[PDB]
């Protein structure tokens, strides 16, 4: 079997999107389809369901009059027309096959993000120093220390979305006083690569 999604991307509060979970490996009609989502960081939250031909549909609360699922039992895909999209919805979307309420088969997910700028890297002077990767969108980031040389004593902290929508993380290293230190920051998502010496 092969449940695989598409549709994800960046969208802002207000707009809408449409996904689709195309099917192979099976007779897509004899099963009820599903939509589950993983809000970055959190766990599992089911979003909605649809049946064999498509007349029965129960949605998770938090939606409807917003979310509308459907399916095309002829060309094998499953749909989800999102509207009214909000921040809360920022998440990775999965479509599982129903067994029942037994998602016996999942898909690899598609990412929907609700909110593009590079980070402003500033220095944080045994001892301890580091870099402050601030105000950037979207994620992720990667911070190396001395081009892959300084590894022992590094703690790149998971980041924190802020009131603006611009993430900002911290990476720190503990070094024995007394050598040059540089953090390698790279925001592949915007083409922002930045090195900043530390003193």
């Amino acid at each position: 079997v092969q449940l695989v999604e598409s549709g994800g991307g960046v969208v802002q509060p207000g707009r809408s999107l449409r996904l689709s979970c195309a099917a192979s490996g099976f007779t897509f009609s004899s099963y009820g389809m599903h939509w589950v989502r993983q809000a970055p960081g959190k766990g599992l939250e089911w979003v909605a369901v649809i049946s064999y031909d498509g007349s029965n549909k129960y949605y998770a609360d938090s939606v409807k009059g917003r979310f509308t699922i459907s399916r095309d039992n002829s060309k094998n895909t499953l749909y989800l027309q999102m509207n009214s999209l909000r921040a809360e919805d920022t998440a990775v979307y999965y479509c599982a096959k129903d067994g029942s309420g037994l998602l016996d088969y999942w898909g690899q997910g598609t990412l929907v993000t609700v909110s593009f700028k590079g980070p402003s890297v500033f220095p944080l002077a045994t001892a301890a120093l580091g870099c402050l990767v601030k105000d950037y969108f979207p994620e992720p980031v990667t911070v190396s220390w001395n081009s892959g040389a300084l590894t022992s004593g590094v703690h790149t902290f998971p980041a924190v979305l802020q009131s603006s929508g611009l993430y900002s993380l911290s990476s720190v290293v503990t070094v024995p006083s007394s050598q040059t230190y540089i953090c390698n920051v790279n925001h592949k998502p915007s083409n922002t690569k930045v090195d900043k010496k530390v003193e």
Binding site: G43, W106, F157, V160, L169, S170
Partner: protein, 211 residues
């Protein structure tokens, strides 16, 4: 809905060991609880369905049990692959099918945190903002929080913390509490402290800096 509560919040075992997970409910859900393994960067997968059953392809190390509210997933001989995030889901009161908030089977004592503080740059202070940063280095257990202080004035909700996953060796954690001020409000003040409270410290600890 029906609340599914998992615990431990995280399992820290090295291969070979036996890991026991628990999924408790608010009502009876019968033997309708399913388990889900979600390896990193991948997608949820069906482990034990209904509470004892193993869906196609699943090895025997995975054993499920329970009936009613309390359940238990049991991985007897931990394998490097079995290190993922395990979810439990009830399919009794459908809809909404509710999920457990997870349990992470992670790989490989009370230590007070080592505190540091970091004054703002200058290259930052021109845009108009100042970010003071506090660092709580390698400490166990996790639970521990920071109270920033601008001239002995308890500060409220203008900070933001982050925590590393549990180190595999120390068995510790780290934390980045960042206080964010305007450059103006920053220049408007004096002592920038960070009071750390933690189980491995008979006495609360502080780290300050006049600017």
């Amino acid at each position: 809905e029906i609340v599914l509560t998992q615990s431990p919040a995280t399992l820290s075992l090295s291969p070979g060991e036996r890991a026991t997970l628990s999924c408790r409910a608010s009502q009876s859900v019968s033997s309708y609880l399913a388990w889900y393994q979600q390896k990193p960067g991948q997608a949820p997968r069906l482990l034990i369905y209904d509470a004892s059953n193993r869906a196609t392809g699943i090895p025997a190390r995975f054993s499920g049990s329970g009936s009613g509210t309390d359940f238990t997933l049991t991985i007897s001989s931990l394998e490097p692959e079995d290190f993922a995030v395990y979810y439990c889901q009830q399919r009794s009161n459908w809809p909404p099918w509710t999920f457990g908030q997870g349990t992470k089977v992670e790989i490989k004592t009370v230590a007070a945190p080592s505190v540091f503080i970091f004054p703002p740059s200058d290259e930052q202070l021109k845009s108009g903002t100042a970010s003071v940063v506090c660092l709580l280095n390698n400490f166990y257990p996790r639970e521990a929080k920071v109270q920033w202080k601008v001239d002995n004035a308890l500060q409220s909700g203008n900070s933001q913390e982050s925590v590393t996953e549990q180190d595999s060796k120390d068995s510790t954690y780290s934390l980045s509490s960042t206080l964010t001020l305007s450059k103006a409000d920053y220049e408007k003040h004096k002592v920038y402290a960070c009071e750390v409270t933690h189980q491995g410290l008979s006495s609360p600890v502080t780290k300050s800096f006049n600017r």
